[PDB]
Amino acid sequence: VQSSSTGKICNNPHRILDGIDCTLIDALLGDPHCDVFQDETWDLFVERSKAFSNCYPYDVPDYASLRSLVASSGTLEFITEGFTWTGVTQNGGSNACKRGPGSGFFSRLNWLTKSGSTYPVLDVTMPNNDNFDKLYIWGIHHPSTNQEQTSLYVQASGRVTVSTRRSQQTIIPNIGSRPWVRGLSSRISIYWTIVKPGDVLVINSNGNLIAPRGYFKMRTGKSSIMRSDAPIDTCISECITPDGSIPNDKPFQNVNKITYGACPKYV
């Protein structure tokens, strides 16, 4: 049985993307310190421990699942789109996610807010004319107070509806004070939608929308994500495990249940 690792994860021959201090999801939404991972691609994306978010307090229900779907796709290729938000102020941002000289936010998200006196009833529609699926990612904002709610979105209680021809998610914000994170008691909640060719993404809301800037090009799940603090070395190796590289010469390995590439069967 194969029962030992070098301890490193060889840079060759699988394109191994070390996220350093960004997890995949932070790199996806675009946490200011993961701007480096934009449009990056991989066979295996290793998430380290250092990893810490550092932007607007958010939670992703269906995290491990959204995490996996992106991990497999192996590309982070984002495609901007011409969304037309008429009646609201775009590019919103904050001090808990500074960028450049001040207030910042997730590069891949567009915080809409009221336009002076009002927040109209938003209702865009974006058709998928292309020959590949689209993975839009959006969010809903939960102010912690009715005051906050009304300063930003006017309406006393907002709503976000993200429909396609076959689905229909209608989440409604939930005002309340969550624990403080980077000075905030507020939170955004990350959701998603995949649009199949010949389909139409339809966003209708009247409050709390955290609008998409475009879509993520999805290829086929050949890649994979893995958590490890294993060093990376310049070497050739085919079987990668959280522990490192283990030769695929023997038919059964017992090093770990998780591995990448032509690997010995786990025991």
């Epitope: 938000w85 008429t86 009646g87 609201v88 102020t89 775009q90 590019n91 919103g92 941002g93 904050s94 001090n95 808990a96 207030s103 807010t113 009221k114 336009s115 002076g116 006196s117 009002t118 005051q147 906050e148 300063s151 930003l152 000075g183």
Partner: antibody, heavy 122, light 110 residues
Amino acid sequence: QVQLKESGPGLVAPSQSLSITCTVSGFLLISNGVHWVRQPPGKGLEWLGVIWAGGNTNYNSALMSRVSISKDNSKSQVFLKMKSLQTDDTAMYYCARDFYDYDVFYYAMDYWGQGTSVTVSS
Amino acid sequence: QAVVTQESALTTSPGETVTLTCRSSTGAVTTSNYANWVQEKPDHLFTGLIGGTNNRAPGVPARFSGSLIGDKAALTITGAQTEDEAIYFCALWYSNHWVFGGGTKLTVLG
């Protein structure tokens, strides 16, 4: 950096139409609003109106019947158009950037333009 | 909409601690008004100083402070210097409509 410049006529005869332009740089008109402030010779400042990031505007109740703020988001230009001009309108016309803080929730006029003088004389 | 009123001019000397004030015909100046304090320097080159009542704008030296003193808003230059001579405009927000004050001329006897 932020920056606002006003380019206008300088001299227009009573009963014509004033048209100032505030060309902003370093921020987007969809991200912020742009305000118009005029300072007649030896007087205080007067707030003309404002065009919000969302395009809707809010004018000074008084002058509203003659004012009209517009903007071409793709050119980075805000437009202050006044009609039925009368001598009183001789003043410095300024456009200042509308700012709103998302964490404390307050409005403020942070970036003022350089201004452009307009004399209404026949 | 309402009428913001403030000192015509005020004459101080270097060192002293002056306090411009900002009144509302319509009543007390609350936080709802976002008291803005603009500083007009020679040849009308305006500069933002304080916003939202007491939030000091970046370049602004620490000695400038925004506050509510009773039912009117205030600005306090603590240790005025000759370089503080300027017309200090106060602006008050009343429902998507701004209303400036008459401005104050600040002399700093040098």
